[PDB]
Design a protein around this nucleic acid. Structure first.
Lengths: 153, 394, 199
RNA sequence: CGGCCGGAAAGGGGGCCGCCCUCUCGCCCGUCACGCACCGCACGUUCGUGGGGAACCUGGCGCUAAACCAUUCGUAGACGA
RNA sequence: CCAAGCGUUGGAUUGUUCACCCACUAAUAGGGAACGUGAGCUGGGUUUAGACCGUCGUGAGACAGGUUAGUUUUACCCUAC
RNA sequence: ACCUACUAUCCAGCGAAACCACAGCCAAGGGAACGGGCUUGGCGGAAUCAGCGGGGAAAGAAGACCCUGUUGAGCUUGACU
RNA sequence: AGCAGAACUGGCGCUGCGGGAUGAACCGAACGCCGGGUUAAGGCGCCCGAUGCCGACGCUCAUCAGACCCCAGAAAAGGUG
């Protein structure tokens, strides 16, 4: 559909997009910035280390009350975290994006992601029960993820 | 209004920044001042806490109720292996303070000292001082070394020496030696520099630095205790049982128009692991390490003039959580700062010791070498064998 | 292009008021020998003037309070800072042009030091009045490098004497040089006297 | 061009010894001749091989390292450290 | 006179501020910081609603007149430490 | 002072609410008579974590304590009808 | 009493501007948008425009000096300073 950014060369570029994915927006954006510049096979290896708590995701913007860890010093930061569902949903997406590149006849082992964008999806409606017979909202925070890879030696 | 009944404040404000120490090794903040009349000597040494035990001695203080009586005193055991001098440092003196002038190391440095220059010894190639040790076998290098030494003859006012401890002789798990600048106090600069040049790559035993019945200073880091409240760190009054939001707190912190909470009020935080400097510690005995002559070793470190028993200061089963003391040691009256295996800085006194307490000689009568791993009741292993007799396993 | 002002015999407020105006005019001013700065009034007056200044500190956190500088150079730097709009961008850019030193640094020992006659004790003070040295005042309130600076300032005193005595002998040969050569330099000499340069 | 020393408070390409080539050319007075004489007009004239950054040059001289994560330790510790 | 550097207590009674007494002590000085200090504590008393007694009021009720029992909420926001 | 359980700590997952003129370092002065903003000074350094209750005359509810209203209700009587 | 109540006139309320560090009432002066010049009250060591006048005449030493109406603090008395 109407992507947010046009690639500099559509022949050497492939796209992927995920809409209304039930995953937290704040954890998705933080791992979207750390995944932006690396190579695709470097991208997949880094995401598996997040699941196994070997490499952390540096929380930069949405970091109020986030605990700090020793693995954030590799990113020049203090606060780190290892989101599982956040890395898992965008692990299938490069798998989806890898399939789009081979269908287009692009070289897999030299793809470099340049653009990745996380947008807020419409919030689901649940509720919680509080004191004195009060009901408070229980807003879910899904988000839209779309990225574009490009061939580069 | 005013406080109803006056009471002194809790905790001194001279040790106010109760943070974790940025250093682990004790630091000499003020070295003893020097006069050219005295010969060149060392002023500081670095030891490790082993354990504590009893002592028996005669008191020879006139005019007391305890004169010519036998007492017991708590004494610390600090295992003090000799150092290896690896370098010297000169200090030019500036109107902005004291500034280092030039640092000159040895030709070859032992690998115990090379541990300090690496965060990870396993992954490193151990390439430190490899090109610096090439300066000692070229004729331009020796002339540059003498030019560096001649430069320190002219301009340097204070000369310290770089010496490190010996982890190979200690039973500790770590192998990383601790470097330390020790100020050399003595005659003029020229003979001071020549003495330290000769002492390069040489063993420095404890007996050169300190002596018996001498006031020394102990510098070290406090035992760690973690995050603690005001009741443990500052020793404040416990609130009554009827308090709603808790009772191990500080009730009234500050006044209103003092709109900021003051720096002098007791707050919770880190307790322990504070750098400290204890003064006026008495050396009852400078011991001797294990040494082998005529085939068998000599271990009568706990022998006195009246005990004459060949037992060592190591108790039955060894020192708790430290190991066995095999090198020479110093015996300091009273408890010292730091836990077991803690690095301790020994330093000569900054004050002129002319008192009845500081000039009293000590004659040890009995050293308690019983097991500290519980309620021990035997000095030596063979004494227990003579009392227990044969066992089932014999 | 750089003003090297010797601080000996200069009044604290009169020198600071002239330096602050020159510094704000884009001129780099280096004030040297700040221990020679002296203040009108008896010594016991200025001590409690500085001792009561020491008492003024923040009650709740003295680390955020007034930074009481004890060096003579930083004391003079403090009184210039109060004579400048240091809360603005141009005030802080001015203070970068000021450079104070106790004693005389080796960058500035072999240089001619300028003297402000308007900011001088001998000019602005009566001979019967009393004055207080800032160098004595600083060490008496917490400065630790008075005897330190005195020996290093003593070291360069005969070192410049060697240069000066060589300088006199160097130009003694110069003044004696004309004494042999008036017969062939009178053509250039008289035209330098008609225009008023050697008369 | 090589050394030699003098510098430590925040340290100079400072001086001296000899070099194979250089001219009384250096500078001041006076002769000869030349130099876009851009036809009245502005940021001209230096410190300026100024600082920094990529890329291009030519060769010589060289060096083949550490930190962090992981794990372990527990003299430490809420997590980090 | 200089002098606030350092100290100015444990208890019987009363909610008490104040006050008195016992004992020790070098002394048991006077005070401020929203008559310091309730998202630090207590609810003993003032000062709700239930009651008892004395005085006054025909009465409902009143009493700087006594007695009794009477819910003491919230920091996860910013600053300060 | 020490020990145990559940928390509080961190992490996998899920995840609000009160509150919010702008937002938040102080001394003195004046001011609508106790300033985070104004004046003069002291000064000031990213992003944060665990506590903490000094301040924000903190949050809760158009003060019920006092007074006015030609606004009312429950009750009493020797008030009027 | 920065309290309450009166008489004349002027101000603030309704009003900005320069000055008095700041300021409802003080001093000067009231306002369309600008350029040049000149002043009022205030000032001319720095902040901060202006004395960087070869300013005049004297007084005053404070170990609590003094510094500009409103106005922000002082008395009787004493001094062989």
């Amino acid at each position: 559909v109407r992507y947010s950014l046009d690639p500099e060369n559509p022949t050497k570029s492939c796209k992927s997009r995920g809409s209304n994915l039930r995953v937290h927006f704040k954890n998705t954006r933080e791992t979207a910035q750390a995944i932006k510049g690396m190579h695709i096979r470097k991208a997949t290896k880094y995401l598996k280390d997040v699941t196994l708590k070997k490499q952390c995701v540096p929380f930069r913007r949405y970091n109020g009350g986030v605990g700090r860890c020793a693995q954030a010093k590799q990113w020049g930061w203090t606060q780190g975290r290892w989101p599982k569902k956040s890395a898992e949903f965008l692990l299938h997406m490069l798998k989806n994006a890898e399939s789009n590149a081979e269908l287009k006849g692009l070289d897999v082992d030299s793809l470099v992601i340049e653009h990745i964008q996380v947008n807020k999806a419409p919030k689901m409606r649940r509720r919680t029960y509080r004191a004195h017979g009060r009901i408070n909202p229980y807003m879910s925070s899904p988000c839209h993820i779309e990225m574009i890879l490009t061939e580069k030696e | 209004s005013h406080r109803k009944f006056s009471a002194p404040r809790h905790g001194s404000l001279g040790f106010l920044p109760r943070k974790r120490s940025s250093r682990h090794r004790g630091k000499v903040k003020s070295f003893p001042k020097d006069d050219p009349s005295k010969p060149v000597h060392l002023t500081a040494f670095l030891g490790y806490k082993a354990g504590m035990t009893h002592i028996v001695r005669e008191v020879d203080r006139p005019g007391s109720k305890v004169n010519k009586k036998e007492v017991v005193e708590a004494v610390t055991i600090v295992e003090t292996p000799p150092m290896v001098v690896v370098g010297i440092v000169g200090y030019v003196e500036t109107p902005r303070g004291l500034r280092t002038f030039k640092t000159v190391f040895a030709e070859h440095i032992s690998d115990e000292c090379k541990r300090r220059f690496y965060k990870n010894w396993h992954k490193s190639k151990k390439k430190a001082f490899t090109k610096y040790c090439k300066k000692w076998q070229d004729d331009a290098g020796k002339r540059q070394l003498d030019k560096d030494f001649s430069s320190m003859k002219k301009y340097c006012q204070v000369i310290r020496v770089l010496a490190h401890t010996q982890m190979r002789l200690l039973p500790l798990r770590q192998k990383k030696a601790h470097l330390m600048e020790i100020q050399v106090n003595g005659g003029t600069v020229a003979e001071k520099l020549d003495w330290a040049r000769e002492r390069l790559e040489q063993q420095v035993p404890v007996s050169q630095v300190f002596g018996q019945d001498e006031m020394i200073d102990v510098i070290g880091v406090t035992k760690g205790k973690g995050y603690k409240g005001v009741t443990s760190r500052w020793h404040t009054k416990k609130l009554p049982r009827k308090t709603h939001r808790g009772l191990r707190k500080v009730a009234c912190i500050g006044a209103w128009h003092p709109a900021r909470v003051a720096f002098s009020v007791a707050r919770a935080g880190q307790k322990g692991y504070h750098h400290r400097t204890e003064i006026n510690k008495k050396i009852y005995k400078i011991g001797q390490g294990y040494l082998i002559k005529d085939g068998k070793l000599i271990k009568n470190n706990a022998s006195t003039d009246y005990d004459l028993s060949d037992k060592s200061i190591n108790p039955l089963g060894g020192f708790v959580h430290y190991g066995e003391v095999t090198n020479d040691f110093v015996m300091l009256k009273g408890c010292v700062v730091g836990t077991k295996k803690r690095v301790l800085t020994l330093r000569k006194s900054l004050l002129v010791q002319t008192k009845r307490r500081a000039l009293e000689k000590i004659d040890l009568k009995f050293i308690d070498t019983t097991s500290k791993f519980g309620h021990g009741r035997f000095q030596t292993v063979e004494e227990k064998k003579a009392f227990m007799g044969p066992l089932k396993k014999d | 292009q750089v003003l090297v002002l010797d601080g000996r015999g200069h009044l604290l407020g009169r020198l600071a008021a002239i330096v602050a105006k020159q510094v704000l005019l884009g001129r780099k001013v280096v004030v040297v020998r700040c221990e020679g700065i002296n203040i009108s009034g008896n010594f016991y007056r200025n001590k409690l003037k500085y001792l009561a200044f020491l008492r003024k500190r923040m009650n709740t956190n003295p680390s955020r309070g007034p930074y009481h500088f004890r060096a003579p150079s930083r004391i003079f730097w403090r009184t210039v800072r109060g004579m400048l709009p240091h809360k603005t961008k141009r005030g802080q850019a001015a203070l970068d042009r000021l450079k104070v030193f106790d004693g005389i640094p080796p960058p500035y020992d072999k240089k001619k030091r300028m003297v402000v006659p308007a900011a001088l004790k001998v000019v602005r003070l009566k001979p019967t009045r009393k004055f207080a040295y800032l160098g004595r005042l600083a060490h008496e309130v917490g400065w630790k490098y008075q005897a330190v600076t005195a020996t290093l300032e003593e070291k360069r005193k005969e070192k410049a004497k060697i240069h000066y005595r060589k300088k006199k002998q160097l130009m003694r040969l110069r003044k004696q040089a004309e004494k042999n050569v008036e017969k062939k330099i009178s053509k250039f000499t008289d035209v330098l006297k008609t225009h008023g340069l050697l008369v």
